[PDB]
Design a protein around this ligand. Structure first.
Ligand code: SFG
Ligand code: SFG
Lengths: 327, 327
């Protein structure tokens, strides 16, 4: 039969739906808001395969507009039909910025978050839709996002760097000189690295450095100018500091609020964490103070390519700056 | 400090050295040939970080020429110095096709194998070096390669395809229509897929379909015209046939010969297996006959980009052909 070039399309959506933490958080977050959704109209921004739109219908929404710009909208329409909802869930192809709805809506639901929250995220589209299509006093799901940072001693990176000095003990050949080379290569760059960590990697109490209430005035301008803030923490114990991890949570309006977290201390998600490596490891001790500032920015070529500007000071070392971008 | 673009370089060599099966097979394969190497000269084709050249010195080689074309040759020279072998192991940058050695050699050692044995493999370079630099009656390590094929029921692919029909049981939304879409996307292409399998995936006894004795007359021409052969087998039981896996082993001349295998039935290696998916699954039963022909070819744009031409016949279905390439 025929050959197709949609491996990427299915794999992205499989990854999302198989993310139990993500998909169940949205299912429950939507269901917990049934009193606000029942008999009401909803706009699903970036509906993908349509599953959130169907969750909304199941929570009692009268009508759902499922807007999806990629080729996958066709599958969403099939999914809607298969669940017998073609009369109340309407799949509309194209960007939400130019879609034509027949009415303003009572609520917007969207899974818009990207790596590091803002990489290739749909947030500006959600905000555009809010301004254009959401009724006054209308509901946004989720309602807010919080950003966190922690210093890390990445156990996998420590193993990769230390590997070369262990070759002698396994094969009888000294390769310890490869360590400086591996350090330059794995850390001496300014790329944001997406990797999953666990609590074993966290070197101080995670710090909330920003909060975004998605309905708030001025957020579109804050995104352009940079989202972020200062942080300070104290190290748990002796370890090589490799840099910092950034992650987020989003919060659904209450029925306590339901929180979808991407912390390394919480169940893994497909978002993992966004890692900001220093150029080389820095030894730290118990109670070493670390302070800094983290700003999430658009890239100049592309506002949806995430840039992170890090200022940091470890102990009595002078403040340093490192300017990262997603690749 | 400075930023570098060598993440790829360290990661490739880390992967090789951390492949215990590979690295220990070469260590032992070389050591088992100490009587042939002792007091002799060796050419290491594609020396990388230099570890095989040092194994040769440790097996008693008088002199080793370590030829490496990529930037990593510099690290090999440092590794040699660190192990006190600068007097007998000489690292020479550039392709082996144009390197100038001061003498012909008694032996060639090389880790030349690529994915599917011949993707981006150094074999033609090894053969060039054999012709130009190896003394008559000289030793090649490894000495031979064998190629295997088996029909597979890929358990991970079965799960990915069947995932969509299971969404209803986990989230209350029917997405079974996504299955045809996922099948077209994941199987309806002609790319060779590199993936690790296990015995749970093997649907019939693996078949050897070719053997390459690396010293033999005419091998360079066989590589250009295509390496391969016919196979026949009978299925173990009822399962979806997804296609075929191809893998290899290489054999070191004897001190029984030491074999480095990349079979899914044997310890995993970084080579994994090369998977050839049909356009859609084919149901088979116990004792379903499967026959075919497999040919490994150069690509027209690039002789080192692997092409695999598959002819296959499942049961009483007509013979089919599918022409694959590495991406
Ligand atoms: N401006 C836009 N308008 C419409 N769709 C968009 C836009 N930007 C991104 N998308 C789509 O938004 C979807 C984002 C997904 N994270 C969410 C998929 C789906 N809602 C789910 O939760 O499984 C993707 O399918 C993108 O193709
Ligand atoms: N024609 C060539 N001449 C010299 N080096 C080559 C050539 N083709 C490939 N290479 C290098 O060959 C090496 C192949 C590696 N598989 C082996 C590395 C090393 N011998 C090891 O076993 O760890 C890589 O470092 C390639 O850069």
């Amino acid at each position: 039969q025929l050959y197709y070039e949609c491996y990427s399309d299915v794999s992205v959506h499989e990854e999302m739906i198989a993310d139990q933490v993500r998909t169940e958080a949205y299912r429950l977050g939507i269901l917990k808001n049934w009193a606000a959704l029942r008999g009401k109209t909803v706009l699903d921004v970036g509906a993908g395969t349509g599953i959130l739109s169907i969750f909304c219908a199941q929570a009692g929404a009268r009508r759902v507009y499922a807007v999806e710009a990629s080729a996958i909208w066709q599958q969403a329409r099939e999914v809607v039909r298969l669940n017998g909802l073609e009369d109340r869930v309407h799949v509309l192809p194209g960007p939400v910025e130019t879609v034509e709805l027949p009415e303003r809506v009572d609520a917007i639901v969207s899974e818009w978050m990207g790596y590091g929250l803002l990489h290739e995220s749909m947030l500006s589209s959600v905000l555009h839709a809010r301004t254009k299509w959401l009724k006054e006093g209308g509901l946004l799901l989720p309602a807010s996002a919080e950003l966190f940072v922690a210093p890390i001693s990445d156990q996998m990176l420590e193993w990769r760097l230390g590997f070369w000095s262990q070759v002698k003990q396994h094969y009888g050949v000294d390769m310890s000189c490869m360590e400086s080379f591996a350090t330059r290569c794995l850390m001496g760059h300014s790329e944001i690295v997406v990797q999953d960590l666990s609590g074993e990697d966290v070197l101080a109490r995670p710090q909330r450095f920003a909060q975004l209430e998605l309905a708030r005035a001025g957020l579109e301008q804050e995104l352009e100018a940079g989202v972020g803030g200062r942080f300070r923490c104290s190290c748990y114990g002796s370890a090589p500091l490799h840099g910092f991890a950034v992650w987020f949570q989003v919060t659904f309006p209450g029925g306590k609020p339901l929180v979808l977290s991407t912390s390394p201390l919480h169940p893994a998600t497909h978002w993992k964490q966004a890692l900001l490596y220093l150029n080389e490891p820095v030894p730290v001790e118990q109670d070493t103070d670390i302070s800094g500032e983290i700003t999430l920015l658009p890239s100049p070529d592309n506002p949806r390519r995430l840039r992170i500007l890090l200022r940091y000071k470890v102990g009595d070392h002078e403040e340093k700056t490192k300017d990262f971008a997603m690749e």
